[PDB]
Amino acid sequence: TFRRLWPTIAPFKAGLIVAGVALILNAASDTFMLSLLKPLLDDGFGKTDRSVLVWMPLVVIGLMILRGITSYVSSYCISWVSGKVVMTMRRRLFGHMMGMPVSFFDKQSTGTLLSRITYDSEQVASSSSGALITVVREGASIIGLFIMMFYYSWQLSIILIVLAPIVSIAIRVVSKRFRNISKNMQNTMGQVTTSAEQMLKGHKEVLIFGGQEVETKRFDKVSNRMRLQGMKMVSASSISDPIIQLIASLALAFVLYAASFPSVMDSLTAGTITVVFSSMIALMRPLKSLTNVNAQFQRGMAACQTLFTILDSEQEKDEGKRVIERATGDVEFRNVTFTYPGRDVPALRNINLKIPAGKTVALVGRSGSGKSTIASLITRFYDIDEGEILMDGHDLREYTLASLRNQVALVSQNVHLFNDTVANNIAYARTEQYSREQIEEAARMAYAMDFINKMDNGLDTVIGENGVLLSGGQRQRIAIARALLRDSPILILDEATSALDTESERAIQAALDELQKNRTSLVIAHRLSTIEKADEIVVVEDGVIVERGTHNDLLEHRGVYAQ
Amino acid sequence: TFRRLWPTIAPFKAGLIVAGVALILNAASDTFMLSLLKPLLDDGFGKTDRSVLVWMPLVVIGLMILRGITSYVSSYCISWVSGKVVMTMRRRLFGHMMGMPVSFFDKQSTGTLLSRITYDSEQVASSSSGALITVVREGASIIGLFIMMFYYSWQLSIILIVLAPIVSIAIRVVSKRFRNISKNMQNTMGQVTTSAEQMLKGHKEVLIFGGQEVETKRFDKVSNRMRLQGMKMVSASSISDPIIQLIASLALAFVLYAASFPSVMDSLTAGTITVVFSSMIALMRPLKSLTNVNAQFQRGMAACQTLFTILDSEQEKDEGKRVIERATGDVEFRNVTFTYPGRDVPALRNINLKIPAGKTVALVGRSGSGKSTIASLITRFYDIDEGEILMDGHDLREYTLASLRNQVALVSQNVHLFNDTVANNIAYARTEQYSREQIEEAARMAYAMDFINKMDNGLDTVIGENGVLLSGGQRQRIAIARALLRDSPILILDEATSALDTESERAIQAALDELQKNRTSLVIAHRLSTIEKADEIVVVEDGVIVERGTHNDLLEHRGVYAQ
């Protein structure tokens, strides 16, 4: 457990320091609160007196006022650092996770990223500050209680420091056994949950085939093996507390027999013995927590190591030198090779593609291997394995990544939607650049003006998902408008078109020709309505270019053309 | 609220009775251990008996043996009931959930299903057994301590019957406020992880459009909202305990001052007074939980209400009277209308379709407004709104669901695999029907045996999770093996994607031809080679058959013919 997180805590260290002084005074309250018992039974009740018993209520009230204020101050000033360190960690990851390139996003799924931001980070300070809240409060409780009992009863104190480590060792080893059995169980606990997944994901095939009963048999078996496993867990875990209480009670008994092993120990008065035993009744909650704290501090640092592994891994490699406002260049590929990460086969073999100005070139083959690759390649989403991609004859890596990504624009049905307004989303990262009037004009050149202007507030409506929740074809429309604003040279266009819209799709084609008035377009070969106007066509099956020809040359060859 | 869980609890009520007799002894053990203090100070240290003190350690150890054995027995038996009720609930849901038709898993419940079977059902008897542990053990600690203090001090402990309701009311209202604020604030806590989800999901369309900085700003301000809301929640939660301890001590102080009256004083000894105060320092933990038990018993039974809603909703509507064995005659559709759930548009309009006997018929509608719906319909996945589909001129509803599903068979790349032996995967619900020889031969007649031996483990390998984990093409081949073995009368091969598996796809085509020796087919026209061998042809869009006739008739609409 090496903490490089301390520079993240250091700016807010004062709060933690206050929490320390907030929590020590908490322990020093309880100790003093137990010390109250010595007067009350000896001076108050052992000896008939009422000064003691009349000042007693106000001090027990005041000490618990101190306890409550300290508890609240500790809970606030520990959250002000577990807040301003969990929030700083979230900010730093979110600034690093969206710079790190999409290859990681294919590697690390889509949901584990959200867990790493929210929950795994919530438990890097909810359990790390869970270790600087017991080590101080419970540790200081142990220290104050021992100083107490040493002051009151010298003997019972020396036997206490003698046997207390025995109890500590007992809790440590018993909790080790329980932790071991729980961790060993949990791997088997996870796997029986997958039978229900198999069957409810697989309802259909189970209906078509006759396997309705035979799967109930499998579920009965795994459910019984889960009942028995859970019983093993709860037995082996619930046994941790009786053994702990028994080994403690052995200490509480050894001390009580020691109270008469010599004839000397008789001198300790009633107040002394009650304070000592009351203090032992409470040393335990602290002598446990303070031994369990290391497990919490390591569990809230495996999380930290996970988050720091996300942070530390190298982000999107940027060595851009050239910059561009609006290139006029034609994209050229020099026998470039590339494979998706984790795939040995070259997704791109030796490929050459020239795309003159305004040439709506395309790459047929329908395999899905190469067309999506070449679509994502010009954006530099995935860097290539060999060769060079040339815009204006300039190496694609040479262009600054921001500039190059600005030059390219991706339009497709799968375009996600930000949670801002219509004007901000359509001019996302550009609202400072553009006025509202420009945005509405661009909506009017798209000819989607009526489609998005009839919303609840038109240009001002909350276009986001979880807001109006705009529809998929109209999402392709909002993508088209967001494109048409930027006026960029390369128009990468997937045209996957999974969702085709009745009576609206036609306007989308009427839009894209205006989106392709200029703006050298690398539209992938798909539905014939858009490919009929194609200036050139290519085929790339399994990453190998086998034909590069116009519409008639493709007609001559076998090809796939009517659909 | 209303426990209809009692018929399933009752067969295992012996565990509950033994736990509730074992936990009452736990509270009695605590009460006797605290009552033992009075002999310690009065008959022990206060006097000088010294044999009472020697008798004491064995009493403490014995009452701790009782405490530990009762705790372990209570845990074991309450788990045996919550183990034999969680398992029963899981089995009953799993047997009732799979009788429910495919309409329920039409994304009405997607992943909440697994939560409902696994986690939500373990909170039906983890927060309903915690509502029986508390009300028994911590509800009887109160009774034991009250009879204790009545015996040891009549002059006091009437103050406690006056006061314990006041502390109860204070704890109730404070926990009410904390519950209200936490429940109100978690709904607004969720928006931050939603914004995170927006950005991590859409890492693409953020790199391209150049708005990394703007979305970092958005996450920055929403994470500030996170920190502020979390600090408000934790402050309102950590003000619940200090106020409880304060109003509690007011009780402590008023009791102590009530000990100041000379009538009360000199009637309470040192042992008596320590017993009374010690019992009160321990009446707090029970009065705390006893009053918040209703929250847990509501949470548990509300989870149970959700599961009972899953259970109670009607299953697949089975009213079949007739039975069918292997009828290979023509399937006749007749003016049958049906909509997917949540859609009012007819996904099928008035349809007439006589499926040719011993021959295939294909659907060239790429829109899918019927092509997948009809395949699901002939399987009776979803019932129809109007009309009748006739199996060999006999109504679909007439035959039993199991029989008809036995008649039909679906093959697709989305045929996921059931984690058993591959031989039993091929013979799901049919392992009794056939011996191994049929299975291993059908593997070769399905052009699969060559691969089944190519698997490293072999024929008896586990197939699904962390097994061989067959590919999509191998999924098609293994599904073809299943369909070949079953000897089904009808083959509803989806042909959803024209898989281009080099060196393996041709084997799949030969496998379909082997499958289509006979068996009226419903292959959905996707691939050129398959439509070439289409004996009849159909094309359906907007729910109505756009054209009905062979390839020559479809030449009129050959705009979509060649891909």
Tab-separated table of C-alpha atoms in Angstrom, chain A residues 161-316:
chain	number	residue	atom	x	y	z
A	161	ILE	CA	-1.727	-4.522	29.058
A	162	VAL	CA	-0.533	-8.111	29.501
A	163	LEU	CA	-3.688	-9.870	28.161
A	164	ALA	CA	-5.015	-7.211	25.741
A	165	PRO	CA	-2.600	-8.287	22.958
A	166	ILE	CA	-3.848	-11.863	23.407
A	167	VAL	CA	-7.378	-10.670	22.634
A	168	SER	CA	-6.032	-8.536	19.758
A	169	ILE	CA	-4.288	-11.597	18.295
A	170	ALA	CA	-7.494	-13.594	18.688
A	171	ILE	CA	-9.584	-11.052	16.763
A	172	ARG	CA	-6.875	-10.762	14.107
A	173	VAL	CA	-6.605	-14.506	13.464
A	174	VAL	CA	-10.367	-15.114	13.627
A	175	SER	CA	-11.060	-12.264	11.207
A	176	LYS	CA	-8.315	-13.676	8.983
A	177	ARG	CA	-10.119	-17.028	8.907
A	178	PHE	CA	-13.460	-15.362	8.158
A	179	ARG	CA	-11.955	-13.176	5.425
A	180	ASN	CA	-10.280	-16.216	3.866
A	181	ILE	CA	-13.470	-18.277	3.821
A	182	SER	CA	-15.546	-15.387	2.443
A	183	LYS	CA	-13.053	-14.610	-0.328
A	184	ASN	CA	-12.773	-18.299	-1.223
A	185	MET	CA	-16.573	-18.573	-1.314
A	186	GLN	CA	-17.246	-15.488	-3.418
A	187	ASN	CA	-15.713	-16.901	-6.612
A	188	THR	CA	-18.094	-19.875	-6.443
A	189	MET	CA	-20.961	-17.576	-5.426
A	190	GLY	CA	-20.534	-15.609	-8.639
A	191	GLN	CA	-20.750	-18.565	-11.005
A	192	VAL	CA	-24.108	-20.029	-9.926
A	193	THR	CA	-25.690	-16.638	-10.649
A	194	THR	CA	-24.875	-17.242	-14.329
A	195	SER	CA	-27.359	-20.115	-14.732
A	196	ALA	CA	-30.264	-17.690	-14.394
A	197	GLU	CA	-28.497	-15.411	-16.874
A	198	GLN	CA	-28.164	-18.287	-19.349
A	199	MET	CA	-31.837	-19.169	-19.068
A	200	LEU	CA	-33.464	-15.721	-19.048
A	201	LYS	CA	-31.201	-14.453	-21.819
A	202	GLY	CA	-32.039	-17.786	-23.458
A	203	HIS	CA	-35.815	-17.896	-23.040
A	204	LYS	CA	-36.372	-18.196	-26.790
A	205	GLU	CA	-34.255	-21.272	-27.560
A	206	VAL	CA	-35.602	-22.895	-24.400
A	207	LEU	CA	-39.095	-22.386	-25.801
A	208	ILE	CA	-38.319	-23.743	-29.274
A	209	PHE	CA	-36.585	-26.828	-27.917
A	210	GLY	CA	-38.258	-28.869	-25.213
A	211	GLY	CA	-35.860	-27.893	-22.435
A	212	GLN	CA	-38.328	-26.277	-20.044
A	213	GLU	CA	-38.132	-28.940	-17.309
A	214	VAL	CA	-34.519	-30.047	-17.801
A	215	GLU	CA	-33.383	-26.494	-17.097
A	216	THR	CA	-35.510	-26.341	-13.950
A	217	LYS	CA	-33.498	-29.370	-12.835
A	218	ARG	CA	-30.228	-27.520	-13.448
A	219	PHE	CA	-31.525	-24.475	-11.595
A	220	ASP	CA	-32.607	-26.654	-8.676
A	221	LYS	CA	-29.110	-28.110	-8.483
A	222	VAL	CA	-27.283	-24.767	-8.627
A	223	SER	CA	-29.801	-23.207	-6.232
A	224	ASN	CA	-29.220	-25.994	-3.708
A	225	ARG	CA	-25.463	-25.622	-4.116
A	226	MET	CA	-25.997	-21.892	-3.474
A	227	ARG	CA	-28.147	-22.430	-0.387
A	228	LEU	CA	-25.495	-24.754	1.018
A	229	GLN	CA	-22.665	-22.375	0.100
A	230	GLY	CA	-24.447	-19.451	1.740
A	231	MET	CA	-25.029	-21.558	4.837
A	232	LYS	CA	-21.324	-22.409	4.895
A	233	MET	CA	-20.517	-18.696	4.660
A	234	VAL	CA	-22.940	-17.566	7.352
A	235	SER	CA	-21.832	-20.346	9.701
A	236	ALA	CA	-18.115	-19.652	9.232
A	237	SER	CA	-18.709	-15.892	9.541
A	238	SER	CA	-21.173	-15.869	12.442
A	239	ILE	CA	-18.781	-18.135	14.346
A	240	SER	CA	-16.309	-15.225	14.377
A	241	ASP	CA	-18.284	-13.347	17.040
A	242	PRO	CA	-18.867	-16.103	19.665
A	243	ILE	CA	-15.200	-17.121	19.677
A	244	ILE	CA	-14.167	-13.471	19.960
A	245	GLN	CA	-16.584	-12.896	22.834
A	246	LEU	CA	-15.406	-16.075	24.559
A	247	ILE	CA	-11.705	-15.223	24.352
A	248	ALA	CA	-12.542	-11.819	25.616
A	249	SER	CA	-14.557	-13.205	28.442
A	250	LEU	CA	-11.537	-15.305	29.372
A	251	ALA	CA	-9.706	-12.022	29.952
A	252	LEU	CA	-12.695	-10.599	31.883
A	253	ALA	CA	-12.619	-13.665	34.058
A	254	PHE	CA	-8.840	-13.792	34.554
A	255	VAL	CA	-8.961	-10.169	35.717
A	256	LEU	CA	-11.834	-10.864	38.104
A	257	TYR	CA	-10.066	-13.857	39.648
A	258	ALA	CA	-6.886	-11.755	39.849
A	259	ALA	CA	-8.951	-9.263	41.846
A	260	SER	CA	-8.741	-11.821	44.697
A	261	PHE	CA	-5.624	-13.837	43.801
A	262	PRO	CA	-3.771	-11.736	46.415
A	263	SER	CA	-5.384	-10.163	49.476
A	264	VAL	CA	-4.022	-6.779	48.350
A	265	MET	CA	-6.395	-6.301	45.363
A	266	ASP	CA	-9.239	-5.896	47.955
A	267	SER	CA	-8.184	-2.213	48.504
A	268	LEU	CA	-9.457	-0.940	45.070
A	269	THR	CA	-12.802	0.628	45.982
A	270	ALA	CA	-16.165	-0.009	44.333
A	271	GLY	CA	-15.724	2.956	42.000
A	272	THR	CA	-12.329	1.698	40.880
A	273	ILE	CA	-13.574	-1.781	39.990
A	274	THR	CA	-16.657	-0.527	38.144
A	275	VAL	CA	-14.570	1.957	36.149
A	276	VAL	CA	-12.045	-0.754	35.253
A	277	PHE	CA	-14.693	-3.293	34.183
A	278	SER	CA	-16.847	-0.658	32.380
A	279	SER	CA	-13.636	0.349	30.545
A	280	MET	CA	-12.934	-3.332	29.611
A	281	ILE	CA	-16.594	-3.695	28.444
A	282	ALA	CA	-15.614	-0.846	26.059
A	283	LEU	CA	-12.028	-1.568	25.286
A	284	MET	CA	-13.338	-4.313	22.994
A	285	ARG	CA	-15.199	-2.247	20.340
A	286	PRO	CA	-11.987	-0.324	19.905
A	287	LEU	CA	-9.587	-3.381	20.184
A	288	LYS	CA	-11.502	-4.941	17.382
A	289	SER	CA	-11.883	-2.020	14.996
A	290	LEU	CA	-8.224	-1.031	15.390
A	291	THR	CA	-7.142	-4.532	14.310
A	292	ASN	CA	-9.671	-4.715	11.459
A	293	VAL	CA	-8.617	-1.268	10.176
A	294	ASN	CA	-5.710	-2.611	8.124
A	295	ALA	CA	-8.081	-4.709	6.017
A	296	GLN	CA	-10.159	-1.593	5.336
A	297	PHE	CA	-7.079	0.452	4.464
A	298	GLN	CA	-5.862	-2.199	2.000
A	299	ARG	CA	-9.326	-2.701	0.484
A	300	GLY	CA	-9.610	1.060	0.015
A	301	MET	CA	-6.195	1.032	-1.667
A	302	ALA	CA	-6.648	-1.828	-4.108
A	303	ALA	CA	-9.311	0.536	-5.438
A	304	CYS	CA	-6.734	3.336	-5.505
A	305	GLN	CA	-4.322	1.125	-7.432
A	306	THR	CA	-7.042	0.328	-9.972
A	307	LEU	CA	-7.802	4.025	-10.465
A	308	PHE	CA	-4.097	4.843	-10.734
A	309	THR	CA	-3.685	2.087	-13.331
A	310	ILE	CA	-6.422	3.766	-15.367
A	311	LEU	CA	-4.674	7.113	-14.891
A	312	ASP	CA	-1.087	6.005	-15.481
A	313	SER	CA	-1.542	4.116	-18.757
A	314	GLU	CA	-0.386	6.223	-21.689
A	315	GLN	CA	-3.109	8.348	-23.260
A	316	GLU	CA	-3.665	9.258	-26.927
